[PDB]
Amino acid sequence: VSRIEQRLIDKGLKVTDQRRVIAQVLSDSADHPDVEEVYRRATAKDPRISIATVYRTVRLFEEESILERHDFGDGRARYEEAPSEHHDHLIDVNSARVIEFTSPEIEALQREIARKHGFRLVGHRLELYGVP
Amino acid sequence: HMVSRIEQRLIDKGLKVTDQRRVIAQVLSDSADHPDVEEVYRRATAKDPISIATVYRTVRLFEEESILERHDFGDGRARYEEAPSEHHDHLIDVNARVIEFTSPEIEALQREIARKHGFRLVGHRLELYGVP
Amino acid sequence: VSRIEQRLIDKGLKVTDQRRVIAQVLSDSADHPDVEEVYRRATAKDPRISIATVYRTVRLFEEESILERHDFGDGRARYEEAPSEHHDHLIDVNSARVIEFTSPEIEALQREIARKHGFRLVGHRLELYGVP
Amino acid sequence: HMVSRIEQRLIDKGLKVTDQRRVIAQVLSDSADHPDVEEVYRRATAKDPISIATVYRTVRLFEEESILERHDFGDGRARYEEAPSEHHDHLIDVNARVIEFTSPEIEALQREIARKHGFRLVGHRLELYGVP
DNA sequence: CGCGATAATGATAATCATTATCCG
DNA sequence: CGCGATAATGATAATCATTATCCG
Ligand SMILES: [Mn+2]
Ligand SMILES: [Mn+2]
Ligand SMILES: [Mn+2]
Ligand SMILES: [Mn+2]
Ligand SMILES: [Mn+2]
Ligand SMILES: [Mn+2]
Ligand SMILES: [Mn+2]
Ligand SMILES: [Mn+2]
């Protein structure tokens, strides 16, 4: 077996060839690509693949914590393979590189801001725009 | 109060002020909250003629021209507000009021993160989502 | 104006950039391509294009006699720019070339076969499979 | 009549004849019409246990093995029949009975068209659609 | 004429026939 | 095990917010 299939086998999901390929595509990606970009990269590896399927997988994979959905501004949701720890993003406004970053002190403050306004933080989003 | 903060900005920016641009300028200057475009249409009919096509065109120009801030609060439609002289961020009740806040310290850290990466931050999006 | 836009202008349809491009794609095509193949060829000419739009156009263009829909066997419908006269197809089973062909005597026989079984022929389909 | 034309073909072709393959073989040998897969399922339940998954798998094998002819009559589902010793073609009531026919002369011409093109025809699809 | 009326666009979900997975 | 139960697939239509076209 492999990392993709094992997750699916353990998560009670049917391992299909396309789920496998989509999984692999996200696996060796540097950038955060939109759903089409995944569809293209998948169909390059294995043609037996629908856009409808690439949409159905991302939703599920997100629901199952196998991949994270971001939304950096443009209509398109960008997708990345869920990482070992949470990370936020710093977008270079010039040559649009993305920098993953982690800050423990912030998440705390953020949950403190929740418990101040009588809230429980079910999720957050932090993106920082920058220039050299 | 006879010419709104935003109508003043159009004037300064040399852009032509139509009765509808004026009306939507009213509505946006009025609002402490963050209406979607539909609410900006309703709020603008409670004053004058204004078409939907138009309300759309306008809140776009305004946004393009830095007069407005567009928010996506994970609920379909875009939501809008006048560009705040006093920067705030957003806690969203996932169930649906949007409490605005400022953490002088989250700001503090954000600046450091960008510094510690060799990037001066020129904007950021920080949103919190939760329940009580 | 041009051939595409004139048809649309005369057919009471809004000329959009994508309708224009899709039209052009079909215009300089040798083969009969599926909807994806059109989507790819379109996006090569002008990126501002949805698959959903490429689907919506083909239906309309067919409904408006601007392009013909065939179905040569595989799931995919193939599409060609509606020609000056009806033609049927001869598929080379070896190196899958398609040969357009016209036969007046057959259509007659076909309408005779209609009027024999008390029918009115609203449409037909003839494809011939061949080898050298 | 105890082993059907089609069960005989499996036997000859060395393929394994299961009770369900046998039953669907019955049903297909029985039918003068052209049932969709659902009707082939109903007709096969009116004899034995047979699952839908299975009816699908079978009429596919049969079709793959040249025992069956698949038709698409422009109405969603595929429709099926035993491979006729006597070739016919199809007039479809667009409103929904399918009268079978033979034009010894359309056959005549088809052969010529392919000849006049330098191709021996090894199969053809000719369907007529109409109302009274 | 920048606007209104309105239909087209685009991202993505839905539908439904057919297909593959999994399991016993 | 080729099968049943069932969910996944693929082509394509539907939805709905936003956008462009056209016209006066
Ligand atoms: Mn964070
Ligand atoms: Mn990331
Ligand atoms: Mn902030
Ligand atoms: Mn605000
Ligand atoms: Mn013909
Ligand atoms: Mn043709
Ligand atoms: Mn024939
Ligand atoms: Mn028949």
Author numbering:
A (entry chain A), C (entry chain A): 2 to 133
B (entry chain B), D (entry chain B): 0 to 48, 50 to 95, 97 to 133
Question: What does the literature reporting this entry say, word for word?
Answer:
In most bacteria, iron homeostasis is regulated primarily by the ferric uptake regulator (Fur). Fur, which was first discovered in Escherichia coli, is a global transcriptional regulator that directly controls the transcription of over 90 genes involved in iron uptake, storage and metabolism. In this study, we present six crystal structures of apo-Fur, holo-Fur, Fur in complex with the Fe2+ transport protein (feoAB1) operator and the P. aeruginosa (or E. coli) Fur box.
The sequence in the final co-crystal of the Fur-Mn2+–P. aeruginosa Fur box complex was 5′-CGCGATAATGATAATCATTATCCGC-3′. The functional structure was generated by a crystallographic twofold axis. Surprisingly, binding of two Fur dimers to one dsDNA target site was found in the Fur-Mn2+–P. aeruginosa Fur box structure, with one dimer bound close to the 5′ end of the coding strand and the other dimer close to the 3′ end. The electron density corresponding to the P. aeruginosa Fur box was sufficiently well resolved to allow unambiguous assignment of the DNA nucleotide sequence, except for one missing base at each 3′ end. The two Fur dimers are positioned on almost opposite sides of the double helix, in contrast to the positioning of other prokaryotic helix-turn-helix motif class repressors, such as the trp repressor. In contrast, the two Fur dimers do interact, mostly in the DNA major groove and between the two antiparallel α3 helices of the Fur dimers. There are two hydrogen bonds, two water-mediated hydrogen bonds and two electrostatic interactions at the interface between Glu37, Tyr40, Arg41 and Thr44 of each dimer, suggesting that the inferred cooperativity arises from cross-dimer protein–protein contacts. Arg57 also forms one hydrogen bond with T15′ of the P. aeruginosa Fur box. The negative electrostatic potential in the minor groove of the P. aeruginosa Fur box is enhanced compared with that of the feoAB1 operator, which might further increase the binding ability. Thus, cooperativity can explain why the P. aeruginosa Fur box can tolerate the loss of shape readout by Lys15 when a Fur monomer is positioned at the end of a DNA fragment in the crystal structure.
